[PDB]
């Protein structure tokens, strides 16, 4: 499956 | 009228023009193409948020940490489009696994009050700890139509 | 040395001790035979326990009220044993699941400690009312072999 | 399924 990395707000 | 759906910005504007207004203005909101996709969340020890892209439309991805974690998904469009879908929310640790499956809110909705009656996935820090790495959660999100 | 696996017995013995003991003295816990079941917990507003029998084993299910509620499952048997098992529990409610799934713990474990790290399905008062009738809820459990 | 209605102890 394809991820996306994602950093906090 | 329809409000921006990110959990600072106070547009608001037609259902045509949220998806024109989260790309010019919300840049740093990564988009992953795909119907079964993986949420990592970074630094869990606040909002995560990204966008999955998949038949057609664009649903709104939201980690949140108020402690107890908060994950919920939401369509960009209305309650009639909202219906034709289903979510799956999977968090998957050393043989253990959390799962969560409901319809997506529309963004008309908004989600506080599907987080304050704990309608999403609902874990608490050491569930969190229990199926991440280092400060590093990963969620499964799954997407399809009924 | 073994103790009573029920959630105010102080009795301790054998792992084969174990069986005969519930059933003798604690002949209000129901068994039920089969490996897909239901266990309906009523007035929910405090443990519920009940036995499910199957693949020639004996497996505490356990719903406590501490408000947040937790639900587990355990194998009156060795944690090798134990080990060749798998537990899921799910609520079901209008158009919203909630699944949780693990290895059953062995009563040599105990279950406060599986309990105290949230492992196990933890779930609150809302959720709780969310998937119940009136004050009665209903779990899906399901054992298999792995 | 078999459902057991189960009372609080
Ligand atoms: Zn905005
Ligand atoms: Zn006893």
């Known amino acids: ?9 | 009228p329809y409000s921006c759906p990110c959990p600072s910005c106070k547009w608001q504007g037609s259902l045509d023009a949220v998806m024109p207004h989260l790309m010019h203005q919300h840049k740093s909101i990564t988009t992953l193409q795909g119907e079964d996709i993986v949420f990592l969340a970074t630094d869990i020890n606040v909002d995560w948020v990204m966008m999955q892209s998949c038949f057609g439309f664009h649903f709104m991805l939201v980690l949140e940490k108020q402690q107890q974690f908060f994950a919920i998904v939401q369509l960009i469009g209305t309650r009639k489009q909202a219906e034709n879908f289903a979510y799956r929310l999977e968090l998957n640790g050393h043989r253990r696994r959390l799962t969560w499956e409901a319809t997506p809110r529309s963004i008309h909705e908004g989600i506080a009050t599907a987080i304050m009656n704990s309608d999403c996935l609902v874990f608490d820090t050491s569930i969190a700890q229990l199926f991440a790495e280092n400060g590093n959660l990963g969620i499964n999100v799954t997407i399809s139509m009924c």
């Open chain 1, 1 to 9: 499956k394809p991820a996306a990395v994602v950093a906090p707000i």
